[PDB]
Ligand binder design. Sequence first.
Ligand SMILES: OC[C@H]1O[C@@H](NC(=S)N/N=C/c2ccc(F)cc2)[C@H](O)[C@@H](O)[C@@H]1O
Ligand SMILES: OC[C@H]1O[C@@H](NC(=S)N/N=C/c2ccc(F)cc2)[C@H](O)[C@@H](O)[C@@H]1O
Ligand SMILES: OC[C@H]1O[C@@H](NC(=S)N/N=C/c2ccc(F)cc2)[C@H](O)[C@@H](O)[C@@H]1O
Ligand SMILES: OC[C@H]1O[C@@H](NC(=S)N/N=C/c2ccc(F)cc2)[C@H](O)[C@@H](O)[C@@H]1O
Lengths: 809, 809
Amino acid sequence: QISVRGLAGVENVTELKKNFNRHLHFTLVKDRNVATPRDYYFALAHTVRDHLVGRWIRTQQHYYEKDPKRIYYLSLEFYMGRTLQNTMVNLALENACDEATYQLGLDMEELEEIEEDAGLGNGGLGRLAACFLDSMATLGLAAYGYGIRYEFGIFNQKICGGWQMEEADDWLRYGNPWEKARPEFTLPVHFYGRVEHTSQGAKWVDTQVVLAMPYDTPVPGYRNNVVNTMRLWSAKAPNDFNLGYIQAVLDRNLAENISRVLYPNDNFFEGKELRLKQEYFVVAATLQDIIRRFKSSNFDAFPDKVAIQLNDTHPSLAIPELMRVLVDLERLDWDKAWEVTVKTCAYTNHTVLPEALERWPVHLLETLLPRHLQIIYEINQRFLNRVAAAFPGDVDRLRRMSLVEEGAVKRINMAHLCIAGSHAVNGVARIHSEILKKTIFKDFYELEPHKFQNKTNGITPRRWLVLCNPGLAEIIAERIGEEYISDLDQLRKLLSYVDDEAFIRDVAKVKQENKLKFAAYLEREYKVHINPNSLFDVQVKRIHEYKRQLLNCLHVITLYNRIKKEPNKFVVPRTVMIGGKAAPGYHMAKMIIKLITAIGDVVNHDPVVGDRLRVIFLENYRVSLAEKVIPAADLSEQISTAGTEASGTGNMKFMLNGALTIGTMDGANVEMAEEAGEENFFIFGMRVEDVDRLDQRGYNAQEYYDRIPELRQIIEQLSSGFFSPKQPDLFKDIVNMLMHHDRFKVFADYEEYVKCQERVSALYKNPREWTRMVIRNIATSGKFSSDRTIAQYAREIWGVEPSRQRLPA
Amino acid sequence: QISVRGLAGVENVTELKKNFNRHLHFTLVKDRNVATPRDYYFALAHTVRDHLVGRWIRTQQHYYEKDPKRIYYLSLEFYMGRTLQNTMVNLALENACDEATYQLGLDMEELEEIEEDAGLGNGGLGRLAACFLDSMATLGLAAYGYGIRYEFGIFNQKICGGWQMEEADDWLRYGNPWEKARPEFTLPVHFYGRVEHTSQGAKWVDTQVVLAMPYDTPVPGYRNNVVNTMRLWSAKAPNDFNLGYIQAVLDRNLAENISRVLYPNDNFFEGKELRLKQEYFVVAATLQDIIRRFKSSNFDAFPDKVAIQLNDTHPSLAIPELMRVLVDLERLDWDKAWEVTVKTCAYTNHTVLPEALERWPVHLLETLLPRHLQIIYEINQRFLNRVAAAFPGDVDRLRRMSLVEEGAVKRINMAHLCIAGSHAVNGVARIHSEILKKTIFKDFYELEPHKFQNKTNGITPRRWLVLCNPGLAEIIAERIGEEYISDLDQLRKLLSYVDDEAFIRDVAKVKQENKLKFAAYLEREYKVHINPNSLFDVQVKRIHEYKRQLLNCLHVITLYNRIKKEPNKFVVPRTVMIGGKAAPGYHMAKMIIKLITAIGDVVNHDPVVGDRLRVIFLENYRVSLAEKVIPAADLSEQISTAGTEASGTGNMKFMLNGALTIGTMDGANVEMAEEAGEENFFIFGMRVEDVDRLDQRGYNAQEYYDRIPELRQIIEQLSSGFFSPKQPDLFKDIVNMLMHHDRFKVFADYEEYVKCQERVSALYKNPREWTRMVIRNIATSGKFSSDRTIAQYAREIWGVEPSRQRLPA
Ligand SMILES: OC[C@H]1O[C@@H](NC(=S)N/N=C/c2ccc(F)cc2)[C@H](O)[C@@H](O)[C@@H]1O
Ligand SMILES: OC[C@H]1O[C@@H](NC(=S)N/N=C/c2ccc(F)cc2)[C@H](O)[C@@H](O)[C@@H]1O
Ligand SMILES: OC[C@H]1O[C@@H](NC(=S)N/N=C/c2ccc(F)cc2)[C@H](O)[C@@H](O)[C@@H]1O
Ligand SMILES: OC[C@H]1O[C@@H](NC(=S)N/N=C/c2ccc(F)cc2)[C@H](O)[C@@H](O)[C@@H]1O
């Protein structure tokens, strides 16, 4: 149907049809009379996966023969979403499969909706890992993602009576056709025990053993025949475990609980033993696998052949684990082992919020990982000796920089461990990396300035344009060809079409089609009715106070109050959509969801409002939902308090897909506005500097309440029970926080936000000028490809050159 | 190589080779350079399973179109063993696969050893279910086996320091290629809750729900293109289960524990809640599936279309569950529902030992299954009213026959429930069925004599001759053709060859080859050395006092003592092999294993004994081990106290494979001796009548100790520490039991057993006459085919005719 989806040749279509029928019969044990829609999905998935096999085997054989430097990306999260369409896109099979299934009397898009998301992450950090794997494969790097195969991913969100309910994401229930179990590479992982000192060094003894069994998932590059591996570990008890009899077998569950469930905290730290076990489990298994692969090729050459990237501090135990193996098992001297470790490891930081930082109680590490605690103490002593030598007499620097935090309970600061033990430390957007050098890691930057880098985040244009928005991809390819898909900078060529009447019309038509499709998806699966001619105002991301869904709520209520005051005045119609999950133990975030639905309950049923304003909470926001809503959006809400969102990546997805952005100068928003031009961005609010000035003076919310009548009215409505008639004081916690304990200064940006929103509405009244500004955004979105990000990691951190060359088919 | 293994045509071999390579590549994601032996096994298993698919789909479609009466065999145990060779045998693919793998440079026998046993049973009862499924498929019956898919089967036995250790049988670790998950037939099962009475009947409410997910395994008939189904249920928590958050997800394990592990008791009853849950789980899920299939075709016709066979009392809850569904859900009146239930259900009893009988405490059923308890009370009331009418004034009969047992804790006698609610009750050998009518169910037989039947057990000659003993199968087929494999009575034709010199030589040669092969298996996998010219004296079966492994031990010690007394006298050399698992909580059985190994420790290292006597404990006795040892045996030990072994089936396996039997007149031994002739059997010991006479007088072990000097010496050796020098009193429990508390009268059969064993040795000195007696045993083993057994169930209980006709290929 459309060109970027590839060729549908007669031989290909015929062979796909034959192989689909073969799998239905031999694999699924069905014929056409009894086959369920799920059966059809599986037949297609097996048919497509067959095409990966040859390329997967030869890619891995190629790395064995050429022995390049290997990149190991360690993460506790890989937020992959669905795999079927992505595989078809990267193999150029989409049109062929569409034709083949059509001839079999099946709708492929219907089949695609059957696949479960692999929801093995919470939000931005997990999705970043996934975009990175795509880009590393596309850039021909010998890269492996290593993580945990959680039996349960991020919970499915249900909304009951306006409240979030959580249910188990049993994503493996029907079996996962995209994985291959690798039982021959099963490895032991040790816990507890004690340290013995012998004539020739320490020994870690009397440990409990849990087995780590790997499952491999293919990561195909974009039409280059490269297929890399994501290896995820599953926990298994040994067979003599606990070995009255019945109970011993039942207790195997205790060991296997390690890989049972993803912790659902986003930017928040809970010091639970199970989480610590998960972190060590992935690190211990991964490092053994890395060492094994390195020997099957003298640890001096280790950093020349191995790079380990730590995705936040979650896998920080790789640093003392590597030291443990090198010193205790391989018998290297300390200083050489340390040199190897530092040159091998690099660390990426993803947040500056203090409550999100991992600080593990010493008593936990003492019991669970006694040898690692000893190694950490020794690292700290040697590091602090370096600090004392560089800054003689500066005793407070010594306590600030210590890996060991003193107080009620002694804790290990894992970020300090990561900096000390890594040759490179990076933030994820220019402003974030600057904040790290100026504030939270200032002392470290002064000691070792060469370690600190920036690597601005990106997203893959395969999933986030070609896959989710084929209509846009096609009209772009019509003018500039297909090369931009793996070289996104080529989108600059579209600046030549900003006055092109045909292109303006096509861009606007593609958006309308996406909006119509999304309006249809809402009616069918949720029975909610929306005006597709309204401005689609979208804020989708995890629920957090810093992200300020509450500021958006205040704007929504402002618009409602203005309409009620002057009902017969024209306003640009809006559909305001807010979606995102709240961490199950985060009370304020759960109250915010309830507020949003409560506002919708009033606004959506007011006859005077009509079709001019609707507020919809998008339930169960996840990767597959993002693929649907993002192409449909007109306005992207990126409204975090300046200095709080390290980068953001949702922002980049909206930019690439033809939405304009309303945002603060925070995270990557700054660089997006720089690329597009400030005139083509809706910027409002305090800058980082203004926030600093306010903190020095002291933030007084009452001042804003006293000076802004429209704000006072909203607070009075919330307090009095206007939005909760049966429970008048339902939102008292929200009001109290806004008035007395607001870390994120919601009121301080209110006036500027409302005014800026008026300017958005003004521009939307002029469709032609709205679309020209859109074209200017899409055209300058190139920098935000994760291909650019990964090429920078490769050159500036890992010491490897990317390659756009094909492997033989 | 040999004829009964089928044809190896050029087209077949070529296609097998191509498909093997295809699976190695696409399914296993390997090439020949990295492939492990396990990879090769899996490639072959997938290659073979492909051949089942068409036949499986058409068999099930045939049953749908013809709508025959369906047979449902309900069992908590299916002891299947390995599936690869069995599938090849039944599809006539063995020679073709052997040739195909040979041309690929692989040894198929080596590949076969990689497969895990499906050890989903304990012993005879579980293995009977498996032979029955084979025979039902071979006889073209529309039959389904229904059970539980245990994650852990019967434990693997390790012997450490002469003691049994248990380890978890993680048989699914690498994945099971012989099953297909059927998630679309997932059904809810209810537990706990309470009963509410409304205007129109009882309602079971406030229950907890566990999901039952089915997995289907094919059961191929012998070369008739029939493939039946064994459907096994796995327990799964619903997604909102327990739905702080982390713990709720972790607690899903509680629901899923239902299908985690097989209870390892053999002929012993433990009233544990988890076991009760397993029993209801299989019954509730199975009955819903049965009803669903019946409707997709007025409950008057239910018994015309459905038969349910209860394998012991373990699935006895089918009776009140069927009533529950018919009365509470379908709204049938009681008397009609009862009529349907009785005509649908039949019950097979497998033991007379009182400690093995299921008697569930009322308080357990009250909490777990409140509605079922009420239904059971109502069944009991109506049944006892019938008894009172038939036997007026017989108040003690009333309490004897009650389903409710009075006392300390009230219990439900599940055997009484089964008799009351079944149209047919059978024992499993003629003597056993007679004992049921005369003793434990005498009252029931008097009330309803027409219900009581005999169905003597059998074994499948596919697994237990063709598969495990191809050499014997071949020399038989040379003389009489191949028809006997599905018509075992044809073996009578071999009586014509009892004086045939060529046949005598061939029978003896096949045995020698099997013995040499088994002697080689022992050296390689266990480093134990045996004389292959010795008489192979084998007792393999679960360890139990009633089976009298202890009597065998006394004989072994007798032989050792005789040798030590007259070292230079000739004796027929023996290798005495004993194997079997002990239930983990059965102390005396564990002590018996230790005794056996302790005897071996003395006998096997005595220089004076030489190669004349060896005692070996066969570790981890299971189906795949039985397939190896049984063909190698010369003497089958079947020495249970008369009246205690209901049938035995190991006995039949040895008879079919050319061993002579030493045995008591117990279980099926009686019928075996009747078929072969008493002259061709080594019968010794008390008959049932003699045991009865001894019990009336009182059994005094001391009498035997006082009158038999050889017995006194053995007891003195055991007591003094001759067999345990470092722990002199190790065996005091054994001695004390033999002297004061022996329910099974070991001493009473000692003298006769030893004398009989002397006659065995005498015959073995004359190889030609030994072999002629063997031929007379093999020739009369026909009756003991499970094809005969199943044809009798079909005609006399189920009301269906077996068919030897082929379905189209
Ligand atoms: O789908 C059911 C089972 O599938 C198994 N995969 C097997 S047998 N081959 N895969 C081959 C493969 C080929 C190409 C791919 F791109 C990925 C996998 C998995 O090991 C198992 O964990 C899973 O439950
Ligand atoms: O760099 C990628 C993105 O990283 C995000 N961090 C996230 S999701 N941290 N989760 C931390 C976490 C902590 C404990 C957990 F149990 C789970 C997750 C940043 O907020 C965002 O600005 C940035 O764009
Ligand atoms: O082997 C890995 C997985 O295999 C799956 N089987 C699939 S995909 N097809 N089987 C088809 C089949 C064909 C012929 C047979 F005689 C049996 C099965 C099972 O459902 C799953 O529980 C198991 O873990
Ligand atoms: O009919 C077949 C065979 O049945 C046997 N019974 C067996 S194995 N009962 N197991 C009972 C059991 C009880 C509780 C459990 F948790 C497990 C098993 C008979 O002893 C044997 O003489 C006969 O040949």
